[PDB]
Ligand binder design. Structure first.
Ligand SMILES: CCCCc1ccc(S(=O)(=O)Nc2ccc(NC(=O)CCC(=O)Nc3ccc(NS(=O)(=O)c4ccc(CCCC)cc4)c(C(=O)O)c3)cc2C(=O)O)cc1
Ligand SMILES: Nc1ncnc2c1ncn2[C@@H]1O[C@H](COP(=O)(O)OP(=O)(O)NP(=O)(O)O)[C@@H](O)[C@H]1O
Ligand SMILES: Nc1ncnc2c1ncn2[C@@H]1O[C@H](COP(=O)(O)OP(=O)(O)NP(=O)(O)O)[C@@H](O)[C@H]1O
Ligand SMILES: CCCCCC/C=C\CCCCCCCCCC(=O)OC[C@H](O)CO
Ligand SMILES: CCCCCC/C=C\CCCCCCCCCC(=O)OC[C@H](O)CO
Ligand SMILES: [Mg+2]
Ligand SMILES: [Mg+2]
Lengths: 569, 569
């Protein structure tokens, strides 16, 4: 339960480059505090000048008005503006850090956690951090200082009476604590339910074709309501708790007021400046009412931001993709699987004691049933999945010794399920590490794949902004953009995971003919089911439930009368 | 520029079932207004009882404290709580309406607009509507009434002086308007940039494999910063405008105060109850300072919510999927394409004068190059794309005459790019219209596809919660879940758009053997490139750039020595 202090301290580490502007908020809120205590002083002055008859003093009051207010504004702005600067800026730094963390999270994270839930963390939670911090830091400092000024003033004015207020403080302290802990639990619940609403909406957007074909609209609406309504009945409860706590505190303050007043309304009243001194105390006691109601109202906002900071720090403390390395060039591309075993988070054993040695500039074809672990094997080469027992040596170097970005930039991949961005055709080909390729480099790539001619037929050529998943292009078309992207990469190691599955006989013929000219001392791993493209591979690896069955050339395996010979049914 | 009134009125149509609780906020904020005006009255009373020596009257002051505060809280809660109820509830209704609208948006919307941009509309914008409305309605009503009470009180107290305040109002009015219009433009900019940040993050999540393989992290970070920073320098500008407007208004109020005071500090002061009457006016003038600063501070929050309501109403007024119909059963499934033409939003002509007549319980195979318009044609049958010229008659009934949900529920679809949810295996098979299928129905479907045995090998059988895109399953595996889903549907019309492209020779053999038993007077359209599965089709349609080339049986077309004969290379 003490974990709040740990989160508070962590947050403070971020406001180290803001110490300069931090005192600029204290100066500003210190003078606004000075302006509120000066109100009580002015009411005593205006009475004393009317009582002890001093019109000469009263002539100054109009000049004092346009001065107290001017000096308030100048301090109120200095305090308010810099608070926002510190807050909004500090949160911008967190938004960056949280995003950077995300890009460092492994492939399993992305698989286990939906877009909606992930989004709510960087969006809703970091946005809640902004609002809560920019309003709580403002109120807590501005109205906190005001309270401290007026408490000080009441002590200088009459410490005998002000000291009776301190006995009523453990009541308020217990009342604010009970409400605070209740609203924190609710803050946790209001943010989770919000990530749930985000999840429901994001999924509906992704699966719009299934939602439409299978008429799932009523069912999506139902689950949207379910999560939407929980989120509503939770924020309502939080508001009831808030809107009920602040006045109960005001009433337990009024009881301290009346008791202090009944003692101040004891026989000997002719001591203080009749009205002047008496009214000044009552005015400074009332000038305290509003800044305190503000301090109790900010508690909802404060519990909300604490729940969000806890979520942000949790995200930033998640285990991420392990990266410690060296910048090797992969040269030609020798690959060695030494007693490799691949276990998925869920305990599935996709690869079992797989051992294979690929020589540089060799075309090795992975063939087998679905569930053989072909994609699983190839995914290990780019560290999408970490080796759990065994080793992968790329040029006799343990794969994990190579710096992650140095490995990836050297291994070209044509994934089984083609992934495209909502960017131009050119931006999709010259993506990431290829974002410095010239227009001529892009056209060269699209020509190497059978992509150039269809690109030229699109409404805007290479500048046709592709839709959501490039779903404004046909099946085989999206597939050739992915090939163009990998060809442009021109990497020592190439990976073709069902790269032709959506291509017509004339596209498949040109691309395979253009992949004969792409054995430029380039090691390539082909996962194909069309026994025609497999046929010309240097080595054929028959896989079954993460193990090798057979190995060898198209002739060798057909002569063996086994699995490969039987696959020629 | 007047469009704000149109948005305001629209919003009012939502608070028709809240008229009951609406007066409960006026009662509550009316008594809190009565409590603030009673402060000025009490300060006059406390002075008058001290001046005109009435200790008997002063004995009541302690009871009045615990009464004014008690009656404030009871009104402040009644006003504050019901405001939140009305606000949060009204917005919940909008969140539902906005979501319902979304599910009614066409397939092109989903293609043209990214998940991130769409999300920001239902999430960020509807969340901004909540915050802005629940805080502006509260402040505008509570502090609006207070201002009206104190203005009234100052008129009863001294209307000769209070009337001089009205000449200073067109100054404040011009000052608040200039600031208001400036913050509105900024509110527009702060929300758009937020949808941009959402877009960048959502894309990064979807394309994590490309971001990883092509090392696009630095580039994603850059664009995240670019949109993140714009959003920061815009909210900062809005805050500067706010934090500078409120005090300038306070100073132009102080000038009206000093002028009213210099007239009240003219020779004849011995008229009013010396302190009593004078102080009461000054106190009620100062009790006005804070609720007015609140009314000028709420302007930022108000411009933010207006920009969001404008966005929400724009979303709700978008053209949606046209739906006017009749509940026909599609019976056996006769389909007639009459001089059909398909033009995509962007002007591409995917289908040109396509005419074809399918008889019920016939297997018609669509064959041709990529870019033939096979997917385009099949997509029209489920109204994913509307016919632009020509007609589609399903059982001699114009397709648009059939009610949308009635068409879709009767046409089973196995899409080219398989789409799966982050739900259990069973929930993915028995999705939407099939969400009432029993466990035995699900197992029957997965057995009909080659799915049952691999499902049984997964960590949790039919209860294995599938990942993001079902990417915790292999290629051919995800494909068989989609087949299972369509088999479970058991529809009169079946559509197989490259439904076997990821299946091994033994899965492809079982499924095609299990699809021979799925010609139960069922019309099926097969888009295949494996000339083996096409071979047994009743009719073969050779397509090229949205036109038919050749038509006929496997024998007829091979004997024709044309395109189909040439495809047998
Ligand atoms: C300690 C624990 C308990 C707390 C407690 C205390 C007291 C009670 S109670 O039941 O007696 N109640 C209350 C008792 C007292 C008060 N308040 C006051 O006596 C102070 C009111 C006031 O006169 N405030 C003011 C005046 C002049 C200003 N400034 S000025 O004179 O320079 C000026 C400038 C500009 C204008 C207007 C410009 C436009 C024309 C007017 C005046 C400014 C400014 O600038 O902020 C502000 C409030 C209350 C209340 O219940 O709310 C109960 C509980
Ligand atoms: N992330 C994952 N978590 C758990 N199990 C997984 C995951 N990815 C794959 N598997 C399982 O591991 C086995 C082999 O997977 P996979 O490597 O994709 O096979 P494959 O040979 O590429 N098959 P396919 O592409 O369909 O012809 C299958 O039973 C998968 O469901
Ligand atoms: N939403 C869209 N907007 C614009 N053009 C599109 C859209 N969808 C498809 N097209 C284009 O229309 C043509 C035919 O599309 P499509 O119907 O998907 O062909 P296909 O025959 O299924 N090809 P394939 O699946 O790759 O073998 C192609 O040139 C596409 O890029
Ligand atoms: C086109 C469909 C792709 C969607 C990607 C959604 C994001 C899910 C993840 O992590 O990615 C998995 C990949 O590593 C397995 O090959
Ligand atoms: C697995 C990849 C699918 C992603 C769907 C993303 C959402 C994009 C839309 O609208 O959907 C298009 C469909 O209609 C064309 O066949
Ligand atoms: Mg695979
Ligand atoms: Mg297609």
């Amino acid at each position: 339960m003490n974990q709040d202090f740990k989160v508070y301290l962590r947050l403070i580490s971020y406001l180290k480059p803001y110490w300069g502007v931090a005192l600029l908020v204290l100066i500003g809120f210190g003078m606004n505090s000075a302006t509120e205590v000066s109100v009580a002083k002015l009411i005593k002055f205006i009475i004393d000048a009317i009582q002890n008859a001093s019109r000469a003093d009263l002539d100054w009051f109009p000049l004092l008005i346009i001065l107290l207010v001017f000096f308030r504004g100048l301090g109120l702005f200095m305090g308010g503006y810099y608070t926002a600067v510190i807050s909004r800026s500090l949160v911008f730094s967190i938004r960056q850090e949280v995003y950077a963390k995300l890009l460092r999270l492994p492939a399993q994270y992305y698989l286990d956690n939906s877009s909606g839930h992930i989004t709510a963390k960087i969006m809703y939670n970091v946005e809640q951090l902004t609002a809560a911090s920019s309003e709580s830091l403002k109120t807590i400092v501005r109205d906190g200082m005001i309270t401290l000024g007026l408490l000080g003033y009441l002590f200088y004015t009459n410490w005998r009476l002000t000291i009776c207020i301190m006995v009523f403080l453990p009541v308020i302290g217990i009342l604010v604590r009970k409400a605070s802990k209740r609203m924190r639990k609710l803050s946790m619940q209001v943010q989770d339910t919000m990530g749930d609403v985000n999840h429901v909406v994001q999924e509906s957007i992704n699966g719009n074709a299934v939602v439409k074909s299978f008429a799932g609209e009523e069912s999506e609406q139902e689950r949207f309501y379910k999560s939407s309504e929980e989120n509503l009945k939770r924020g309502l409860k939080m508001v009831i708790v808030q809107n009920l706590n602040s006045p109960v505190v005001q009433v337990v303050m009024a009881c301290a007021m009346a008791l202090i007043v009944w003692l101040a309304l004891r026989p000997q009243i002719l001591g203080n400046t009749t009205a002047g001194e008496f009214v000044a105390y009552i005015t400074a006691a009332g000038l305290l009412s509003k800044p305190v109601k503000n301090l109790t109202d900010v508690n909802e906002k404060l519990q909300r931001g604490l729940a969000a900071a806890h979520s942000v720090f949790e995200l930033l403390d998640l285990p991420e993709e392990q990266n410690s390395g060296e910048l090797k060039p992969q040269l030609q591309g020798a690959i060695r699987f030494d007693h490799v075993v691949l276990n998925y988070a869920d305990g599935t054993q996709a690869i079992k004691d797989f051992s294979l040695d690929i020589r540089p500039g060799e075309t090795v074809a992975l063939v087998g049933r679905s569930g053989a672990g072909k994609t699983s094997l190839v995914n290990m080469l780019v560290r999408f999945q970490e080796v759990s027992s065994g080793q992968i040596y790329l040029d006799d170097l343990p794969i994990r010794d190579i710096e992650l970005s140095s490995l990836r930039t050297q291994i070209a991949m044509v994934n089984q399920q083609v992934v495209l961005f909502n960017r131009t055709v050119r931006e999709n080909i010259a993506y990431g590490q290829l974002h410095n390729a010239s227009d001529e480099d892009v056209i060269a790539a699209a020509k190497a794949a059978y992509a150039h001619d269809f690109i030229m037929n699109l409404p805007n050529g290479y500048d046709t902004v592709l839709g959501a998943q490039g779903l404004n292009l046909s099946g085989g078309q999206r597939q050739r953009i992915a090939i163009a992207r990998a060809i442009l990469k021109n990497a020592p190691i190439l990976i073709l995971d069902e790269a032709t599955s959506a291509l017509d006989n004339e596209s498949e013929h040109f691309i395979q003919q253009a992949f004969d000219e792409a054995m430029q001392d380039r090691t390539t791993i082909v996962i194909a089911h069309r026994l025609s493209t497999i046929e010309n591979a240097d080595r054929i690896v028959v896989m079954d439930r993460g193990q090798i069955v057979e190995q060898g050339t198209h002739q060798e395996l057909l002569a063996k009368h086994g699995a490969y010979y039987q696959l020629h049914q």
